[PDB]
Paper text:
In Gram-negative Escherichia coli bacteria, FtsZ recruits cytosolic, transmembrane, periplasmic, and outer membrane proteins, assembling the divisome that facilitates bacterial cell division. FtsB and FtsL are small bitopic inner membrane proteins (103 and 121 residues in E. coli, respectively). Previously, the structure of the periplasmic domain of FtsQ from E. coli has been solved by X-ray crystallography and shown to consist of two subdomains, named α and β.
Inspired by the SPR results, we purified the complex between the periplasmic domains of E. coli FtsB (residues 22 to 103) and FtsQ (residues 58 to 276). FtsN interacts independently of FtsB with FtsQ, whereas the interaction of FtsQ with FtsL is not additive with FtsB. FtsB binds to the C-terminal β domain of FtsQ, presumably furthest away from the membrane. Only a C-terminal portion of FtsB was resolved in the crystals, comprising residues 64 to 87. FtsB forms a helix, followed by a linker largely in β-strand conformation, leading to the final β-strand that extends the central β-sheet of the FtsQ β domain by binding to its last β-strand. The only helix resolved in FtsB, approximately residues 65 to 75, makes a number of charged interactions with the rest of FtsB and FtsQ, most notably two salt bridges that may be involved in stabilizing FtsB’s conformation (E68-R79 and R72-E82). The region in FtsQ that interacts with FtsB has Y248 at its center and is at the membrane-distal end of the protein, which is in agreement with the previous cross-link data. Although FtsB 88V is not included in the structure, the last resolved residue, L87, is immediately juxtaposed to FtsQ S250, and Y248 in FtsQ is the central residue of the hydrophobic patch on FtsQ that binds FtsB.
Residue numbers in the entry:
A (entry chain A): 58 to 260
B (entry chain B): 64 to 87
């Protein structure tokens, strides 16, 4: 029996597969096992695998082809979400030097959060602001973190009007922080037509 | 919890010591 492993692999390493197999049969090998259980075992021991196919090719060969999920953001913190809203996780020894945007929300809200992250990032992009973090509460209030580390508190209201107010007001907040030797730390927008600004000393 | 601070903030124009307020 030869075991042929194929597909584009960014997180899986070969011991992940062989362990899934031995942990089911024995220290001996694998051929006329059920291909559907070899497939199910691998789906369950490797939660970052989005698709795996297991197929017997004679002479004597078992061929496994892998498709991995691809993260576009960390989800809450220890997990990850892809561009279609799917949730998965990767042992953090293997992801500890990646730098991804950061989403947060209640346990089944990834798609909703990712949608809001997309829409709001679009608007901030029209003014060359870029979104590093986005958190949504069970009540569906929003807080954003720019790449320049300013936090924005949007609460629950028309988040897009409050977003536009930040951008309008930003040049004076920056002149003001410029003048007093401080840095902008956050901008609370949860008012009818104003903003409260918290400062911080310069790093 | 933070619902209270949203009304406190939105319904009455209240802030927190140290913050600067801007009205447009």
């Amino acid at each position: 029996s030869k075991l042929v492993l194929t597909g584009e692999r960014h997180y899986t390493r070969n011991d992940d597969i062989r362990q899934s197999i031995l942990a089911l049969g024995e220290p001996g090998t694998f051929m006329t096992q059920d291909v559907n259980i070899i497939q199910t075992q691998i789906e369950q021991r490797l939660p970052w695998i989005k698709q795996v196919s297991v197929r017997k090719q004679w002479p004597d060969e078992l061929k496994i082809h892998l498709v991995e999920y691809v993260p576009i953001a960390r989800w809450n913190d220890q997990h990850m979400v892809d561009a279609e809203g799917n949730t998965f996780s990767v042992p953090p020894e293997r992801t500890s030097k990646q730098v991804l945007p950061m989403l947060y929300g209640p346990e089944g809200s990834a798609n909703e959060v990712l949608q809001g992250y997309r829409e709001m990032g679009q608007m901030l992009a029209k003014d060359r602001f870029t979104l590093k973090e986005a958190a949504m509460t069970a009540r569906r209030s929003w807080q954003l973190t720019l790449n320049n580390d300013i936090k924005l508190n949007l609460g629950r209201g028309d988040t897009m009007k409050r977003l536009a107010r930040f951008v309008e007001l930003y040049p004076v907040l920056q002149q003001q922080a410029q003048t007093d030797g401080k840095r902008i730390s956050y901008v609370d927008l949860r008012y009818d037509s104003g903003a409260a600004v918290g400062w911080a000393p310069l790093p | 919890q933070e619902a209270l601070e949203e009304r406190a903030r939105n319904e009455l124009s209240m802030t927190r010591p140290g913050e600067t307020f801007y009205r447009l």
